[PDB]
Design a protein around this ligand. Structure first.
Ligand SMILES: [Mg+2]
Ligand SMILES: [Mg+2]
Ligand SMILES: [Mg+2]
Lengths: 524, 527, 523
């Protein structure tokens, strides 16, 4: 129970951590705490190197190389060990999709649409599922190749597959408060994630309807998430890659107005003579309005309330006013109050009054939906503001897109790179989009490399594992019902033979010779 | 704490159970205990109807119909919810493969070759995995169709998919003793299995090597497994279908000689001057012999030892004696001592001595391998003997085959049906066989219906889910690395559009509208 | 694919559901949807009777009987199968504590303090853990008793233990949005919960500091949670008991001002010249103030800002005005604007202006903490307001208390019962309170019955399973290290013998004879 020895131990631990943090891997990484803050929080067990951290360091070097050479790590969302066993041959990262987990892999076995409302261990369990398969196939392959007696015999086995393919996994929106974020990160690190991504949505107001809309959280609240991930990683001595995703491009709601950076984008009513939306909608339900009647009331309320962003409200009032030099007043205002200027509403009100000589009515409480969420006009510029705020706390940033648009992706890349010219970018290639019909074959073929030239060094089709599986098993079910073993022979087996799929020899692929060898060793 | 009230309650429970058991579903089912034996063992909780038992009754009807009409329920092993969501459109049963589970679905997340050495909750967990997906997609689809406001609107949605596709699941070899068999069965029933299959292998001596060989257990030991499955089902009031599988067709070993029905097939040494195999092989290892030298010594020991079946040993001795009417003596012997006669070795020794006038040397301890397992000559007739023994305790029987052989499948079917003319048969369609090369296209096309005409009413490709997934994800990985989104557009999306794969609309398929509907219902209420 | 057949099927399903809902079990239950709304959502599988629903019906009857007779179902939080196997002998309900689960039972095996940040399957898994143990011991016991050949042999075995003890389980705050609430409820019903409780806290701003404070959600948001639980239960044909808990008695924060019922209680600044708290605290951190300096600045800001409830601000302004008959005016205002009147801030502003002849500054954005949460003055009356709102959607209501106070429990009971005279109440008996020191032995002895006479028909010590285990295993660890097998002989075994603990015969208790019997039957 020696006090001075404890202080000395912690100071030395702190210095080991400081030294770690001086590695070049961390050159862009902002930390909101000290080395000693971490030392006092990580217990007395010898520092563990987690296998995931090995893969994290490999992932960093893979991505760094793509960045330097202007190329792309392409991947897609993997379902299962079969899939990663094939992907390993052709791809240099693996993605794990929370969407695919919700439909195929919840730890409660209750499936459903993508709401991140499976139990929080679901995606970490999928990480373990794939990671331990990777390690197994790695062991199997080494043992097989160790049996070669000459260079020629080794050549006959084929080039080795690199099964140790770093995994980046969906951490959704944290699955609760910051303590959940911490525990989630811990599971991911324990179970084999080289990196994870977390998005600036709520965990309490997620929606899945087609028309439904989408709520984000205040900028700082997501920053604190990212800080908490890195804190857990620091406590566990992991080099975990962190991907910050913003969903603000199509956000229509925000959970709170507390962050001044958000204020530009928050929608207010300019009609002081209208009742609050929430109370109106509630009154209408109380007298038993139908679902169509409620859509009518809402759409008319929004029209009559005069919903605007504040800068629009101000500019509109200036154009109406008796003032001279309107165009130059507006240019002055707009240079102080813009999507990227992060001007607080208080500051913008001051400037507005100085110009108009009075205070215009603007109220962003009135339009709140019944859950209390504020109306919010998301878009590309909003996403740039947010990604810029996230960038110090994230190794890659990512604007969620539902529509592949080169120009918008250019605008986001350049917007971010204006403040962070070396920022790594990620891009999701939307599986909802009608690729075959809505862009030319040649554009399909080049799309990824063109985004690669913009600095999108990691790109992935979230749902490809799901779709390739669905197509193949649909077609074989159909063809098997019709043609029996002929369908298997021609549409599965022959194709496996032609394409050189190792699973064809399913006993060997599964590791039968590997385990047989363990048996022989033990009974020798 | 009234004694008479308890006796009366249990007698009434017994009579409910007796009445259940008189249902025609049970007409071929032999039970080795009474209704009251079960009543006293099932607790005081109201009898539960398990969802799995609903599916079991549906499965029985599906299979009964195929049997009566001479057709086949075709299926294959399913990996995941995506697969069963597509299979439900075209197939009337689902199979769950322990092979696929060991490579893709162990509850420890440690994969490997098919040794049933994942934790025993693995295949039951896979059942739940697929079953709850079935129920979810059923809920989703009903809700979607409920929105149709006219016959024409409903027609536009298409025919309904039957997502409630009965599942038959691999229960391996029981994962231990009879108490494990019981617990395994319980999990399966709780988690949604319409039927399970269990095989007469060991759980302690399973092998995976290419040439490795294969041990079975004594006939009665597997019978007791099947009895234990049915006992659990009876305790839980489930109509669970039970499939008895024998792996004896290519068995080379048996774990014990205790069952007299096995005796015909147990290999003995006829040379009384040879050392025990196990001790010879051990000595050779201890002198540092190489892996090839050990295969040489084993093959040499087997020929020096004069390994044969007893009836062969006897016939050989008769032919090499000085006796009259050898062919008639041999016919007399073989009519009493045959693969299907279930004659004990003692009885066969007695007949042999009555014919030859002396006792011949025959020792089946000497050939035992180092684990102590006996050498055993499996084959079609062996499988018939075993399936016949299993049949009273099983709704289907199944001879595991690695090689699709029409003539052998005919022999097994007829051999079993001679004693059990109404017996349902199952057949596995080997995914390792080279179908494209070793059968004409026409033979491929007809194979299943040809076995169907023999009474194989349930046939399945164990590993088809694995292979279709592997092929598609291999090809896309290759093509995606090369051609990027062009590959996705042409080789996935366009094909999904052309083939009418509902998953293409992935939000709707996943049930986004269903859950959106729950949200609206819950928030459609007043302050 | 016949349209008319589908409509007819759904109408018939709807009518079965309507019949179910006409049972007297549902007499106080408000439903915000129709029978057919449920019919179209529950799929084409035959209706399942879940074992949990059987236990729910038993639980309802147990609680109804206690209510009618003025008695109490006593229980406490159970850890494991050993515990419920003993509890079954003496108690008529079982409680499962989320607190105990976070320390002992997370499905990730990562423990920690009570933040409901284990994976959401954690408490449902604990339900299954205990429920399947109950069923097993029930089977064991029936088989054992079936071997008695006469009344005398049966008497020798003792009275039967009722192992089928209905379980009420902690559903925390829903573990996310309403879709999570739904999925959580579904697991609970599948895995054997006779009832669950859910509380009006956030799932995103939970705190554990002794310091720390406590955020609730808007009234309606929790109502919607309770509606969603009942909706899931209706889809699954379960009689599941629902307990609505409010944590508003010691709440200091609320997540949003959207619900007009909350407005009375929301703290506002009355000083129109003060900077926003969040921006002040941020500026102070950016200058690198220490943890003591920041505590100083917060308390200084709260002073300078003039934090009050609106009705206080109004009363203060009246006392400081030149108006006549101040006491009459204040009484008029407070009679229209009170904790239970659910008066919107707009309405209260209107009355205030009518009295004072001007509008007073009152701003509840300014005091928000940095996460954006509003300052909120919780208390007994707040909890009454909320429990009243919950009551139509809940079979029991429950004001979370950390201090056992008869008078406060009386106020809450009577406050609720004034609007809902048949409302069942639940009470948690605090394990953090110093019972031995801070009330007399006689008061200890009567406390539960005295609350029972107020209508608290279900009362439980959340953490008792944890504490009895901790005490016993601490003491044996100590004594075993010192005295070896002597400690085991005297402090465990002899005591087990004296007290008649069946586990002493551990083979028999574990069900060795039961399973041996299954073996015999098969062989
Ligand atoms: Mg996702
Ligand atoms: Mg198998
Ligand atoms: Mg709790």
């Amino acid at each position: 129970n020696d006090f001075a020895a404890l202080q000395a131990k912690l100071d030395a631990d702190a210095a080991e951590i400081e030294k770690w943090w001086s590695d070049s891997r961390w050159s862009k990484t902002k930390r909101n705490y000290s080395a000693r803050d971490i030392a006092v929080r990580r217990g007395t067990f010898p520092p563990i190197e987690y296998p995931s951290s090995v893969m994290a360091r490999k992932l960093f070097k893979v991505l760094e190389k793509h960045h330097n050479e202007g190329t792309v790590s392409k991947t897609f969302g993997a379902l299962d060990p079969v899939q990663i066993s094939q992907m390993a041959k052709y791809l240099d990262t693996i993605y794990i999709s929370g969407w695919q987990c919700s439909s195929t892999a919840s730890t409660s076995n209750e499936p459903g649409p993508d709401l991140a409302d499976y139990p929080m261990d679901t995606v970490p369990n999928k990480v373990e599922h794939l990671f331990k398969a990777q390690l197994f196939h790695d062991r199997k392959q080494l043992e097989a190749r160790s049996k070669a007696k000459s260079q020629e015999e080794l050549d006959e086995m084929g080039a080795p597959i690199d099964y140790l393919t770093p995994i980046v996994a969906d951490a959704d929106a944290g699955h609760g408060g910051l303590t959940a974020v911490f525990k989630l990160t811990k599971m991911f690190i324990e179970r084999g994630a080289a990196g994870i991504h977390m998005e600036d949505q709520t965990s309490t107001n997620k929606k899945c309807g087609h028309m439904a809309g989408r709520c984000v959280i205040p900028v700082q609240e997501h920053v604190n998430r990212l800080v908490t991930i890195r804190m857990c990683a620091d406590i566990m001595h992991s080099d975990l890659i962190v991907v910050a995703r913003t969903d603000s491009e199509a956000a229509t709601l925000i959970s709170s107005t507390i962050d001044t950076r958000d204020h530009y984008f928050i929608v207010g009513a300019t009609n002081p003579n209208i009742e609050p939306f929430a109370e109106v909608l509630n009154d209408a339900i109380m007298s038993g309005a139908s679902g169509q009647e409620l859509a009518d009331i809402e759409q008319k309320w929004c029209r009559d309330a005069g919903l605007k962003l504040f800068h629009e409200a101000v500019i509109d009032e200036i154009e109406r006013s008796a003032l001279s030099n309107k165009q130059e007043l507006i240019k002055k205002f707009t240079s102080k109050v813009g999507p990227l200027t992060e001007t607080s509403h208080r500051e913008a009100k001051k400037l507005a009054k100085e110009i108009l000589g009075h205070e215009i009515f603007f109220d962003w409480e009135l339009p709140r939906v019944r859950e209390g969420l504020y109306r919010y006009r998301g878009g590309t510029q909003c996403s740039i503001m947010r990604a810029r705020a996230f960038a110090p706390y994230a190794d890659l940033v990512w604007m969620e897109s539902n529509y592949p648009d080169f120009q918008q992706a250019k605008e986001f890349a350049e917007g971010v790179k204006e403040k962070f010219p070396d920022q790594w970018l990620a891009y999701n290639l939307s599986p909802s989009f009608n690729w075959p019909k809505a862009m030319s074959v040649d554009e399909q073929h080049t799309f990824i490399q063109r985004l690669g030239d913009l600095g999108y060094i990691w790109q992935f089709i979230t749902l490809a594992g799901l779709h390739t599986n669905a197509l193949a098993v649909h077609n074989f079910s159909r063809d098997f019902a019709k043609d029996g073993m002929k369908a298997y022979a021609q549409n599965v087996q022959q194709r496996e033979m032609d394409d050189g799929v190792d699973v064809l020899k399913h006993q060997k692929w599964s590791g039968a010779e590997y385990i047989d060898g363990l048996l022989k060793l033990a009974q020798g």
